[PDB]
Ligand binder design. Sequence first.
Ligand SMILES: COc1cccc2ncnc(N[C@@H]3C[C@H](CO)[C@@H](O)[C@H]3O)c12
Ligand SMILES: [Mg+2]
Lengths: 115, 381
Amino acid sequence: GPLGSNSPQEEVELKKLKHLEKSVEKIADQLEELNKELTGIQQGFLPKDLQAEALCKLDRRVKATIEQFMKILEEIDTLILPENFKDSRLKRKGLVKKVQAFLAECDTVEQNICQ
Amino acid sequence: MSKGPAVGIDLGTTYSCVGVFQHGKVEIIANDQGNRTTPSYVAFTDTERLIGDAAKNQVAMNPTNTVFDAKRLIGRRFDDAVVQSDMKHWPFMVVNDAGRPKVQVEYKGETKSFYPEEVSSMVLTKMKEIAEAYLGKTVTNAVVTVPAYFNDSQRQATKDAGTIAGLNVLRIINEPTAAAIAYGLDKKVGAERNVLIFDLGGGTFDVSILTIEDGIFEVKSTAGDTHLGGEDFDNRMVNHFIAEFKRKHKKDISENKRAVRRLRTACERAKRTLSSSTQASIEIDSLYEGIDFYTSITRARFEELNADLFRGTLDPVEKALRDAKLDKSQIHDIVLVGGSTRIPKIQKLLQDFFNGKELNKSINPDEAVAYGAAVQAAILS
Ligand SMILES: COc1cccc2ncnc(N[C@@H]3C[C@H](CO)[C@@H](O)[C@H]3O)c12
Ligand SMILES: [Mg+2]
């Protein structure tokens, strides 16, 4: 529709997306920590049996991270944004792609440990 | 904490509900998450045991050690056909302990087995704690509901679950009787009343014919489908969308579990929108291979995708009427129980079958059984 037609209604949608962006950042931090813990197990002195257990506790935490990212996608999917909500639509698309890039990172971890 | 009142608990296959009659009205109690129903789910993890919403919320992470449907097992023999048929669809393992089924899980790193009444007791403990958290008083007395088709063993196994949960099970009442009590059908002036309870909720379909005379509830017949509910209606919308995505983009999203899940979650919400609106829109960004899926469905299309399933609900009604030896015109009252009875087409089919007869549907369908159990609980308090 028109240009320079930012509405108060769209501010409400942008606020929902900004909360979601913030939740994604916290989940992402958890992913990075899991990544440090993985390197930690690989570069530590755990014998084979205890290493298997530590990687499986790590696996359950990576599955939890994946679930949180999936719950964010399902929350973003409840949004209906009018075509004129260009800023919200761009932000929704960018956040979904960012979550999908994080999911692909979770999958490299998850598929490579405790199979 | 001081001593509180008696509560009514609806112990469902997939969800449970607790109610309390106070200040002249029934109050359905919300759980710690603000939900008026709690999943009948128990999760066993390396570090803890989770009940209700916390157990369901981690099912995708820990499928094998998350138990649900204990109601389909409670009071049954291992070799029961229902047990044998059902265990092919459960991700958790069911073992034979000298003729009795047990669910085998991994709990705190160890292989552990639990009887169905022990799983149901953890669910009942959760309902007790939900009542206590709201009332700020100790809850010991309860009226617990069971399906009318339940046998002596199944009824006793439910009472034992109440006992193990630390509850004083004042009365075990049939679900259609509780539904009839909620609408005060026993308090209607006249001769004996024939009541049809149409229960479509929590993955089961149950039809029951009751005759109420001088407050004596009599179950003339029971019919239904063990497996039928909202999940089936959801799947049909999922199939419709997968086919639409193939026609529009020439891509099959069926093998991508995450894409199918996003779609299934959106369909279940669209289905709910279709119960009060004639159209629902869905917008899913980057659903599969970076493709945005923006679409809509009419109530009419949803009804056509489910026509056999919706029409199929009348066969049990016809079977129950034949077993009760009654004509459809002899049914004084019809009661809707279960969340899927909110579907306009199901309501339309049943009212048309009953020749324009008004349905008792003003009480939330998901809460009607707990509501009737709470009224009964207050009469016994
Ligand atoms: C809260 O639920 C609803 C609210 C409003 C309309 C609904 N229409 C259909 N199913 C509903 N609920 C279904 C009940 C059934 C229980 O296992 C589920 O499949 C729900 O989707 C509706
Ligand atoms: Mg793994």
